[PDB]
């Protein structure tokens, strides 16, 4: 229990690293799409672990149920050529890959800090050695969950954003028809 | 690429002896024993020649014999341009 | 805007500090605005607990550097099954 | 360890057990003729990918925007009382905008596969 | 008005035949003009620089945004005229310039995205608007799908713009992770002093700025400009640049930034020098756009930039429209049509244009000298205002680099005029078909603005003093 | 008839249908100076036919 | 925030150093967006603030529309050439 169940988040992180590497290294691009589906299941696992199971279900519904399905549909209908990962083609990238890995990872951990000193900026990243104290109160009498609150703000406080999104979806219809259909 | 592993004779003989416990045929301990024996032709024995026969060659036959297990540009692009790929 | 709204439609975790800082900024001007530095500090503290983590690091460093016993009402961890037992 | 998680673990186990039983008990004798793809008893030549119609692409592509439209109504149905009349008006406007796109799709005949060959209707005329 | 036009157009175009295309565009053209002249009076709202937050603080309306919206309307009117009106009535021109069925809708949706970027007061508004404009622009780049170059350009645009959209999204989310806010309005002088936001805000600035193609990420957009149909290129090289630059000017998130200073210098150098060896007209104009983007990038380093930015962007938009229209008009006089999407490709094809149409070459001369910055043309006053702004704020080395870049880019600007005033052996005697009255009047109005607009300089400053102070 | 020069007086091509040949497609050349035109009406004659 | 950050960085590197096929580029785009959303949702939980989750929902909808348009562009590109090269762009 405890040992496994304490490091569930860390396991999801390790699996995510492995899944990304497998996406990039796959011989068949269909296999790459399947590893992308695996990565999305791992992301849903992480979101459940941090308390957002509704986003787990939404991600499964939309990114696997719709986007990955479209991916597979397209690779099935279309003639794709792909080359395999090899030293002759890809060892030339290793120096730049290593420098970029270190620089981008460190900077992506440092952008979150507010300390003036750069080394302290990086050090704060690994600085959660403490547990959060979860406490109760009794001020919420309604049964309001994340989905309900999202509906509440999206339809009232930010209604304009919803209507603009309607225009964006209109684009997602009109555009594909404009460039995939030949009129007359 | 066919995968080859070399193992110590004791370990592999133990494995083959263990696997003899299942009901379907499986590599024998005695076949592991024979793996250390190379073919020895009797100096005085009749051969294919005495039957007026000429054995075929393994290299020439292998492709035919193994066909079901086979794995599977510049001009092609230009030629592809002339064809139709999407329709009504 | 959804600023100030929690995951349940109430006020988010750090709303109080933010509201007191906004009261400060509303009462002052650009020249006086630095007078509101403590409020903003408190706001950022609530957001990120940086000073709290520093203070805990100090206390834990001194705790692990002590062989003398501790005599104070302690904290006890129990299984979720054992909530209310005995 | 509630019933939910145990059931979800148990299903794949049973699938794998049935697969294992089939592997363990059935014979396995591949050979070249058996390994051929079944196409009515004959063999066909390998071909360049078939040219497909655009409606095949369009159904799958248009699934995604319509699916997102439908799924964006989940926050509304979970918040209908809270947003009551204001949000009802807003959701009506949102639906009408998406219906304009449905209208575009319907009037352009975007998912119709047209039979390319049609009967000839020209008159027969003789130059006397 | 814009949203209404988009809805009505989708319905009407759905019920219309491909032969109605130009007619439909004409309708929308006049509609836009009407909105410009009947709804103009709303400028009064912004007297004494009154600012309005709108839509639950999602949008911001002031005199700056109102002016940018008027400018974008005017640009849309000019560009839609080029699709609604035939230059000539012969078969070749029908083949060269025919509007697609859905192009007008894509233009109007892209304009909506641009105007929403300009008015964005919250980061969620900014991201939705940016993706609206980006997706529209990809579809506009792709809609001429018989062209190999256009389809390849659309793919390149999709991928590079997607990477930059991801950079913008990541910037916004880091800002949220530091401040628990999505609005720049929460930034105060005290907050800027207390926290280091520079890396976050510069990441946002760079994500926005690489989307209009500043150096060192300039070649991909220049390739897209070269490889699109010319009437698409006129639109897609102008509107995004205006929207993104206007948002950054109004946001003022990079004041005295060292990184922006260095990238602006690099952009001026790359734009001036890299235009020198170009032989294709659209590549030359793309490097010109890069240099003028560097000029405007300089204004992101200082406060109180509104007058110089508005002046520069207005005169630059006018000149960009004029030069593309002149190139389009010259197609009738060239010997060799390269293809149906880009009828004219090489600068050398303009050789001897003065003997075929002298006043077209006079228009070209005026526009070229405005780009160079000769007084009293509008370009001179744009550059003068920018120099006043940067020297008031201590950017001395950058002012010298600006002078040097101006001199260098003058060479490739003069290339056009130079070939255009040489001699050609077989010159035009007569032709029965006249170019369209509408488009010639529009081009002439642009030329006259470039030539005589300076007469209104002091009047303009007087009005600016009461609407922006 | 005089050879075209560019903005720096460098040699510049003259273009007409000659540059859409067989041996000048797939030429190694920077996009700024490349003259082969894959949308040219003489290379796109039977496309998707 | 570690898992989102690692996913984003590795997806970006896969996109950049992709020299294999165009589908990998599409996938790397999608997964970079996923990583950004993960970072955002963790911060939303830690602040107990609905703004992060609202932005994440909008990100999901926009990723859907972007996928639809990107694949339409790919199909239109395929229509003229009949194949996608391992440099197909
Ligand atoms: C239930 C548990 C699993 C049951 C599996 C049974 C089995 O192994 O059958 C093998 C059997 C072997 O096939 P085959 O036709 O004989 O091919 C082998 C060659 O022809 C020639 O055969 P070979 O000489 O290469 O031998 C291959 C060998 C494998 O041997 C090795 O490679 C190991 C070599 C290392 C030896 C030393 C190791 C160290 C030992 C330590 C000492 C002890 O397998 C065996 O020897 C037989 C299996 C061992 C069972 C013995 C049990 C004895 C005690 C009872 O499989 C089949 O019959 C094919 C059925 C079709 C399978 C379709 C589905 C496959 C994909 C499933 C994927 C699942 C993914 C799920 C996630
Ligand atoms: C009450 C019954 C429950 C009701 C329904 C369940 C099924 C009941 C039927 C139970 C047994 C009948 C089916 C048994 C049966 O056909 O295998 C016969 C042998 O035959 C026995 O002598 C092999 C011994 C058979 C072992 C019987 C185990 C019975 C319980 C199974 C659990 C044919 O395989 P086989 O010789 O080619 O041997 C093997 C085998 O098929 C594969 O696992 C090997 O990998 C492959 O190399 C192949 O060579
Ligand atoms: C899509 C792909 C998605 C990939 C995502 C992964 C990437 C994550 C992070 C990357 C984000 C994007 C990166 C963008 C490039 C970053 C460059 C950048 O921001 O400009 C710098 C960063 O100033 C740092 O202090 C920041 C210094 C950099 C941090 C140090 C480097 C650590 C690496 C260790 C080796 C901003 O200072 P600035 O120009 O205003 O310069 C000055 C200066 O800051 C002040 O003294 C002045 O007062 C001020 O007025 C100004 O003049
Ligand atoms: C402050 C800056 C803001 C705005 C300043 C810009 C422009 C000035 C303001 C308003 C512009 C409106 C001008 C209307 C008066 C202009 C005007 O004479 O009619 C037209 C052009 O008319 C537009 O093409 C009308 C196009 C209107 C759009 C112009 C916008 C530029 C030119 O006459 P035209 O003799 O050649 O027209 C004749 C005649 O009409 C036909 O019957 C003949 O058959 C034909 O041969 C034709 O030649
Ligand atoms: C009867 C309705 C007709 C109105 C239609 C307007 C369409 C705009 C289309 C294209 C833009 C072209 C330039 C707009 C002129 C700026 C006016 C202004 O003064 O700009 C100021 C702000 O100055 C600035 O920042 C600097 C502007 C830089 C201008 C650079 C070009 C100068 C050359 C122009 C010469 C004028 C030609 C007159 C011909 C006799 C805003 O003025 P405002 O916001 O208070 O609005 C005016 C009241 N209005 C709505 C009724 C018109
Ligand atoms: C670990 C990464 C992911 C982390 C956890 C997984 C997340 C949930 C996964 C959801 C399941 C659907 C997606 C599964 C991913 C698909 C895996 C895959 O890519 O399989 C195809 C691939 C075929 O490639 P191949 O040509 O055979 O490589 C030969 C190299 N010599 O085969 C391979 O590449 C290797 C063989 C894969 C065998 C997969 C067996 C598991 C099948 C799924 C079971 C799901 C759980 C039940 C309590
Ligand atoms: C839950 C039940 C899981 C049972 C799965 C057990 C698989 C055992 C079957 C096997 O031995 O491998 C079969 C596999 C077939 O593939 P292959 O023979 O290489 O090619 C045939 C193409 N006509 O041959 C292979 O290539 C092996 C692929 C999987 C590797 C597993 C190695 C199993 C070794 C047995 C000891
Ligand atoms: C304008 C208002 C001021 C006009 C003052 C003079 C009015 C009368 C001009 C005149 O007499 O005609 C000039 C010239 C001759 O007329 P014409 O005989 O018809 O031309 C032969 C072919 N028809 O007419 C022409 O030939 C027109 C040919 C134009 C040649 C284009 C190259 C000259 C470009 C001038 C550079 C302007 C740059 C502006 C920048 C700032 C300049 C201070
Ligand atoms: C801080 C320093 C600022 C000044 C120095 C850098 C300015 C760059 C000028 C561009 C240039 O040199 O243009 C080149 C011009 C003449 O053009 P061309 O060489 O004959 O060919 C181009 C024309 N064609 C192709 C038609 C033949 O010559 C000059 O005017 C140099 C005078 C500089 C003073 C020393």
Give E135-194 as a DSSP string: HHHHHHHHS-TT-HHHHHHHHHHHHHHHHHHHHHHHHHHHHHHHHS-S-GGG--HHHHHH
Q: Would you give the DSSP letter of residue A63?
A: I
Q: Would you give the DSSP letter of residue B44?
A: S
Probe site for chain F from G80, G83, G85, G89 (most F CB atoms < 10 A)? G80
Q: Are E300 and E248 in contact (CB under 8 A)?
A: yes
Helical (H) or strand (E) element with E354: helix E353-356
Phi, psi (5° rounding) for residue B87?
-130, 180
Q: What is the 3-state secondary structure (H, E, C) of E384-427?
A: HHHHHHHHHCCCHHHHHHHHHHHHHHHHHHHHHHHHHCCCCCCC
Q: Cα separation of E110 and E133, whole Å?
A: 5
Cα–Cα separations (whole angstroms), residue E117 to C2, E39, E167, E197: 20, 21, 17, 22
Distance, CA of C9 to chain centre: 21
Pairing of strands D52-53, B86-87: parallel
Give the count of alpha carbons within 13 A of F8, CB side only: 12
Pairing of strands B86-87, E52-54: unpaired
Q: Cα separation of D95 and D93, whole Å?
A: 5
CB atoms closer than 10 angstroms to residue A136: 4
Q: Given an 8 Å threshold on Cβ–Cβ distance, is A158 in contact with E18?
A: no
Between vectors from CA E379 to CA E378 and to CA E383, what angle results, nearest 5°? 120
Q: Are E205 and E79 in contact (CB under 8 A)?
A: no
Between vectors from CA E92 to CA E86 and to CA E95, what angle results, nearest 5°? 75
Q: Tell me if chain A has a CB within 8 Å of the CB of G70.
A: no
Q: Cα separation of E220 and E210, whole Å?
A: 10
Helix axes E148-179, E123-142, angle to 10 degrees: 170
Q: Cα separation of F39 and F33, whole Å?
A: 16
Kindly tell me the burial class for residue E321, based on how many C-beta atoms sit within 10 Å of its own C-beta (0-12, 13-18, 19 or more): buried
E78: Cβ–Cβ under 8 A, 6 or more apart, which residues?
E321, E442, E446
User: Which atom number of ligand 4 is nearest to the Cα of residue E446?
Assistant: 31
Please spell the DSSP secondary structure of chain F, one letter per residue.
-PPPB-TTS-B----SGGGS-STTTT----TTT----TTSTTTSTTTT-
Tokens of D39: 């196409």
Tokens of E294: 């560097």
Any bridge partners for residue A74, and if so which? Answer: none
Any bridge partners for residue D53, and if so which? Answer: B87
Any bridge partners for residue E54, and if so which? Answer: E59
Closest residue, chain G, to F44 (C-alpha) = G80
**A162: nearest Cα among E185, D105, E58:** E58
Q: Given an 8 Å threshold on Cβ–Cβ distance, is G50 in contact with C6?
A: yes
Q: Cα separation of E75 and E78, whole Å?
A: 5
In D22-76, at which residue ranges do the beta strands (DSSP E only) sit?
52-53
Q: Would you give the DSSP letter of residue E347?
A: G
Q: Would you give the DSSP letter of residue B26?
A: -
Q: Cα separation of E67 and E385, whole Å?
A: 18
Tokens of B23: 């009901």
Kindly tell me the burial class for residue A65, based on how many C-beta atoms sit within 10 Å of its own C-beta (0-12, 13-18, 19 or more): middle
CB atoms closer than 10 angstroms to residue E2: 18
Question: E378 CA distance to ligand 5 centroid (A)?
Answer: 14
**G77: nearest Cα among G7, G26, G9, G19:** G26
Q: Cα separation of E465 and E70, whole Å?
A: 19
Give chain G positions within 8 Å (CB) of D62.
68
Give the count of alpha carbons within 13 A of D90, CB side only: 27
Q: Cα separation of D70 and E282, whole Å?
A: 44
In G39-84, at which residue ranges do the beta strands (DSSP E only) sit?
none
Q: Cα separation of E371 and E353, whole Å?
A: 20
Q: Are A67 and A172 in contact (CB under 8 A)?
A: no
Q: Cα separation of E431 and F39, whole Å?
A: 29
Phi, psi (5° rounding) for residue A80?
-110, 135
CB atoms closer than 10 angstroms to residue C4: 17
Distance, CA of E439 to chain centre: 19
Q: Cα separation of E14 and E16, whole Å?
A: 6
Domain that holds residue E293: 1-469
**A50: nearest Cα among G64, G53, C13, C16:** G53
> Is there an interface between B and F (3+ Cβ pairs < 8 A)?
yes
Q: Tell me if chain G has a CB within 8 Å of the CB of A108.
A: yes
CB pairs under 8 A between E and G: 89
Q: Cα separation of E209 and E299, whole Å?
A: 13
**E127: nearest Cα among A170, G26, G63, A43:** G63
Q: Would you give the DSSP letter of residue D72?
A: T
Tokens of G75: 């199909």
Q: Give the number of whichever ligand sits closest to the CA of residue E361.
A: 8
- Residue position matching structure tokens 């986007």: A67
Task: Tell me the residues of chain G between 66 and 85 that have a Cβ less than 8 Å away from chain C.
Answer: none
Q: Are E186 and E154 in contact (CB under 8 A)?
A: no
Q: Cα separation of A64 and G34, whole Å?
A: 12
User: Which atom number of ligand 1 is nearest to the Cα of residue D28?
Assistant: 58
Q: Are A17 and A8 in contact (CB under 8 A)?
A: no
Distance, CA of A92 to chain centre: 29
Q: Tell me if chain E has a CB within 8 Å of the CB of F29.
A: no
Helical (H) or strand (E) element with E441: helix E437-452
Overall CATH class of domain D3-28+32-108: mainly alpha
Question: G59 CA distance to ligand 2 centroid (A)?
Answer: 54
- SS3 of E429, please? coil
End-to-end CA distance of chain A: 66
How many domains does chain E divide into?
1
- Where do the structural domains in chain A lie, given as residue ranges? 5-184
Tokens of E460: 């303009």
Give chain E positions within 8 Å (CB) of F33.
277, 279
Closest residue, chain E, to G24 (C-alpha) = E159
Phi, psi (5° rounding) for residue E120?
-75, 120
Q: Are G64 and A67 in contact (CB under 8 A)?
A: yes
- Where do the structural domains in chain G lie, given as residue ranges? 1-89
Phi, psi (5° rounding) for residue D46?
-65, 135
E220: Cβ–Cβ under 8 A, 6 or more apart, which residues?
E156, E160, E213
Q: What is the 3-state secondary structure (H, E, C) of E224-290?
A: HHHCCCHHHHHHHCCHHHHHHHHHHHHHCCCCCCHHHHHHHHHHHHHHHHHCCCCCEHHHHHHHHHH
Cα–Cα separations (whole angstroms), residue G43 to A49, A94, C40: 14, 33, 19
Q: Are G55 and E183 in contact (CB under 8 A)?
A: no
Q: Cα separation of A108 and B18, whole Å?
A: 54
- SS3 of E440, please? helix
- SS3 of E331, please? helix
- Residue position matching structure tokens 């992101």: E300
Q: Tell me if chain G has a CB within 8 Å of the CB of B51.
A: no
Cα–Cα separations (whole angstroms), residue A99 to A18, A105, G13: 20, 10, 11
Kindly tell me the burial class for residue C78, based on how many C-beta atoms sit within 10 Å of its own C-beta (0-12, 13-18, 19 or more): exposed
Q: Are G36 and A108 in contact (CB under 8 A)?
A: no
Phi, psi (5° rounding) for residue F11?
-60, 135
Distance, CA of B85 to chain centre: 41
Q: What is the 3-state secondary structure (H, E, C) of A74-141?
A: HHHHCCECCCCCCHHHHHHHHHHHHHHHHHHHHHHHHCCCCCCCHHHHHHHHCCCCCCCCCCCCCCCC
- SS3 of B82, please? coil
Phi, psi (5° rounding) for residue E348?
-60, -20
Q: Are E131 and E109 in contact (CB under 8 A)?
A: no
Any bridge partners for residue E69, and if so which? Answer: none
Any bridge partners for residue E346, and if so which? Answer: E280
Radius of gyration, CA atoms only, chain A: 22
Pairing of strands E52-54, E59-61: antiparallel
Pick left, alpha or beta for residue E57 (phi over 0 → left; psi -120 to 50 → alpha; otherwise beta): left
How close F19 comes to chain G (CA, Å)?
22
Q: Cα separation of C39 and C25, whole Å?
A: 9
Q: Cα separation of D59 and A174, whole Å?
A: 13
User: Which atom number of ligand 5 is nearest to the Cα of residue E318?
Assistant: 12
Q: Given an 8 Å threshold on Cβ–Cβ distance, is E283 in contact with F32?
A: yes
Cis peptide before E376 (omega within 30 of 0): yes
Q: Would you give the DSSP letter of residue A51?
A: T
Give chain B positions within 8 Å (CB) of G81.
77, 80-81, 85
**A73: nearest Cα among E153, E143, D62, G11:** D62
Any bridge partners for residue C11, and if so which? Answer: C5
Pairing of strands D52-53, E52-54: unpaired
Helical (H) or strand (E) element with C1: none
- SS3 of D74, please? helix
**E406: nearest Cα among E258, E245, E283, E294:** E294
Q: Tell me if chain G has a CB within 8 Å of the CB of C13.
A: yes
Of the candidates B74, B82, B85, which has its C-beta nearest F46's C-beta?
Answer: B82
Does ligand 6 have an atom closer than 6 angstroms to the CB of A40? no
- SS3 of E335, please? coil
Q: Cα separation of G14 and D124, whole Å?
A: 65
Q: Cα separation of A2 and A4, whole Å?
A: 6
- SS3 of E45, please? helix
Sequence-separated contacts (24+) of A101-110 with Cβ below 8 Å: A101/G9, A101/G13, A104/G9, A104/G12, A104/G13, A105/G5, A105/G6, A105/G9, A107/E199, A108/G5, A108/G8, A108/G9, A109/G5, A110/E199
Q: Cα separation of C21 and C42, whole Å?
A: 9
Cis peptide before E216 (omega within 30 of 0): yes
A142: Cβ–Cβ under 8 A, 6 or more apart, which residues?
C8, C9
- SS3 of D44, please? coil
Q: Are E172 and G40 in contact (CB under 8 A)?
A: no
Q: Cα separation of E213 and E399, whole Å?
A: 22
User: Which atom number of ligand 6 is nearest to the Cα of residue D12?
Assistant: 47
**A124: nearest Cα among C55, C53, G7, C45:** C53
Helical (H) or strand (E) element with B87: strand B86-87
Sign, CA dihedral C61-C62-C64-C65, equals positive
Q: Would you give the DSSP letter of residue E95?
A: H
Q: Cα separation of E128 and E132, whole Å?
A: 6
Please spell the DSSP secondary structure of E358-390, one letter per residue.
HHHHHHHHHHHHHHHT-TTSHHHHHHHHHHHHH
Tokens of A71: 């991916």
The overall longest dimension of chain G from CA atoms, in Å, is: 51
Q: Whose CA is nearest to atom 26 of ligand 5?
A: E311
Q: Are E204 and E127 in contact (CB under 8 A)?
A: no
Phi, psi (5° rounding) for residue E60?
-125, 130
């Amino acid at each position: 229990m405890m040992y496994l169940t304490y490091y569930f988040i860390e396991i999801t992180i390790f699996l995510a690293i492995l899944c990304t590497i497998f996406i990039i290294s796959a011989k068949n691009p269909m296999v790459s799409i399947l590893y992308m589906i695996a990565l999305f299941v791992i992301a849903a696992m992480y979101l459940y672990l941090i308390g957002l199971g509704i986003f787990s279900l939404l991600y499964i519904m939309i990114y696997i149920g719709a986007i990955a399905v479209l991916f597979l549909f397209i690779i099935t209908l279309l003639d794709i050529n792909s080359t395999e990962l090899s030293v002759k083609s890809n060892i030339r990238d290793l120096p730049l890959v290593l420098i970029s890995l270190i620089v981008l990872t460190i900077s992506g951990l440092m952008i979150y800090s507010n300390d003036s000193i750069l080394i302290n900026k990086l050090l704060e990243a690994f600085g959660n050695d403490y547990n959060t104290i979860i406490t109760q109160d009794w001020f919420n009498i309604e049964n309001t969950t994340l989905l309900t609150t999202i509906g509440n703000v999206l339809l009232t406080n930010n209604a304009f954003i919803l209507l603009v999104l309607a225009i964006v979806l209109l684009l997602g219809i009109i555009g594909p028809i404009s460039i995939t259909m030949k009129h007359k | 690429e066919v995968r080859h592993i070399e193992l110590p004779k004791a370990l592999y003989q133990a494995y083959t002896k263990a696997t003899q416990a299942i009901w379907w045929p499986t590599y024998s301990p005695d076949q592991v024993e024979r793996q250390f024996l190379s073919q020895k032709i009797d100096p005085s024995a009749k051969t294919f020649n005495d039957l007026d026969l000429t054995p075929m060659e393994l290299p020439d036959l292998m492709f035919k014999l193994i066909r079901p297990y086979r794995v599977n540009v510049s001009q092609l692009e230009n030629k592809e341009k002339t064809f139709v790929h999407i329709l009504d | 805007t959804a600023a100030g709204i929690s995951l349940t439609g109430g006020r988010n975790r750090c709303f109080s500090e933010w509201q007191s800082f906004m009261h400060c900024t509303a009462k002052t001007d650009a020249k006086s605005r630095a007078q509101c530095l403590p409020n903003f500090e408190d706001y950022m503290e609530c957001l990120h607990h940086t000073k709290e983590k520093a203070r805990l690091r100090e206390i834990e460093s001194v705790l692990k550097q002590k062989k003398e016993g501790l005599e104070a009402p302690p904290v006890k961890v129990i299984p979720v099954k054992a909530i209310g037992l005995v | 360890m509630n019933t939910f998680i145990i059931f979800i673990i148990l299903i794949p186990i049973v699938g794998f057990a049935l697969l294992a039983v089939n592997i363990l008990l059935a014979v396995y004798k591949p050979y070249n003729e058996k390994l051929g793809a079944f196409e009515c008893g004959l063999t066909s030549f390998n071909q360049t990918r078939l040219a497909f119609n655009a409606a095949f692409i369009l159904v799958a592509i248009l699934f995604l925007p319509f699916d997102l439209e439908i799924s964006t109504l989940l926050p509304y149905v979970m918040s209908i009382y809270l947003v009551s009349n204001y949000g009802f008006t807003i959701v009506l406007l949102f639906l009408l905008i998406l219906i304009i796109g449905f209208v575009y799709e319907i009037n352009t005949n975007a998912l119709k596969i047209n039979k390319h060959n049609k009967p000839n209707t020209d008159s027969l005329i003789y130059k006397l | 008005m814009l949203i209404l036009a988009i809805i009505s157009l989708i319905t009407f175009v759905s019920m219309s035949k491909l032969s109605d295309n130009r007619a439909i565009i004409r309708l929308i053209n006049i509609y836009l003009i009407l909105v410009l002249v009947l709804d103009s009076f709303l400028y009064l709202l912004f007297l004494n620089n009154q600012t309005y937050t709108v839509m639950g603080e999602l949008l911001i309306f002031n005199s700056f945004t109102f002016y940018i919206d008027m400018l974008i309307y005017f640009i849309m009117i000019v560009i839609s005229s080029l699709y609604g009106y035939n230059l000539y009535n012969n078969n070749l021109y029908k083949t060269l310039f025919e509007p697609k069925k859905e192009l007008i809708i894509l233009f109007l949706i892209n304009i909506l995205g641009a105007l929403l970027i300009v008015h964005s007061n919250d980061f969620i508004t900014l991201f939705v608007a940016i993706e609206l404009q980006s997706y529209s622009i990809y579809l506009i780049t792709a809609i001429y799908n018989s062209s190999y170059k256009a389809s390849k350009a659309s793919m390149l645009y999709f991928f590079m713009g997607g990477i930059l959209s991801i950079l913008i999204a990541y910037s916004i989310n880091t800002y949220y992770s530091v401040l628990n806010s999505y609005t720049l309005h929460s930034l105060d002088s005290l907050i800027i002093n207390t926290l280091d936001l520079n890396l976050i805000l510069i990441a946002l600035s760079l994500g926005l700025l690489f989307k209009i193609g500043i150096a060192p990420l300039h070649k991909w957009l220049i390739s897209i400009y070269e490889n699109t149909p010319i009437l698409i290129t006129i639109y897609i090289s102008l509107i995004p640049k205006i929207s993104i630059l206007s948002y950054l000017v109004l946001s003022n998130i990079s004041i005295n930034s060292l990184v922006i200073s260095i990238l602006a210098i690099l952009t001026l150098l790359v734009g001036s020098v890299g235009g020198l060896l170009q032989i294709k007209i659209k590549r030359l104009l793309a490097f010109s756009g890069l240099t003028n983007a560097g000029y405007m990038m300089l204004l992101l380093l200082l406060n109180n930039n509104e007058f110089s930015y508005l002046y520069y962007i207005t005169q630059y938009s006018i000149s960009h429209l004029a030069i593309f229209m002149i190139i389009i008009f010259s197609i009738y006089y060239i010997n060799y049509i390269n293809n149906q999407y880009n009828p004219i490709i090489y600068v050398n094809q303009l050789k001897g244009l003065i003997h075929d149409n002298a006043y077209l070459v006079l228009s070209m001369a005026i526009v070229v000298f405005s780009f160079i910055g000769i007084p009293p043309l509008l370009g001179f006053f744009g550059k003068l205002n920018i120099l006043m702004s940067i020297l008031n704020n201590g950017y001395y080395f950058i002012s010298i680099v600006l002078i040097v870049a101006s001199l260098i880019s003058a060479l490739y600007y003069l290339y056009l005029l130079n070939v255009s005033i040489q001699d050609k052996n077989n010159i035009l005697i007569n032709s029965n078909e006249t170019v369209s009255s509408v488009l010639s009047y529009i081009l002439s109005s642009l030329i006259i603005l470039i030539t005589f607009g300076f007469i209104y300089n002091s009047l303009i400053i007087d009005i600016f003093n009461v609407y922006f102070n | 008839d005089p050879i075209p020069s560019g903005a720096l007086g460098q040699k510049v091509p003259h273009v007409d249908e000659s540059h859409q040949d067989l041996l000048f497609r797939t030429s190694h050349m920077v996009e700024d100076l490349e003259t082969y035109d894959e949308d040219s009406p003489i290379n796109t004659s039977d496309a998707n036919t | 925030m570690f898992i989102g950050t690692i996913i984003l960085v590795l997806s970006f590197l896969g996109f950049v150093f992709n020299r294999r096929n165009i589908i990998l580029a599409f996938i790397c785009l999608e997964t970079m967006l996923l990583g950004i959303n993960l970072i955002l949702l963790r911060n939303s939980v830690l602040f107990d603030d609905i703004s992060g989750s609202l932005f994440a929902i909008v990100i999901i909808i926009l990723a859907g529309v972007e996928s639809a348009i990107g694949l339409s562009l790919l199909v239109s590109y395929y229509r003229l050439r009949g194949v996608i090269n391992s440099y197909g762009i």
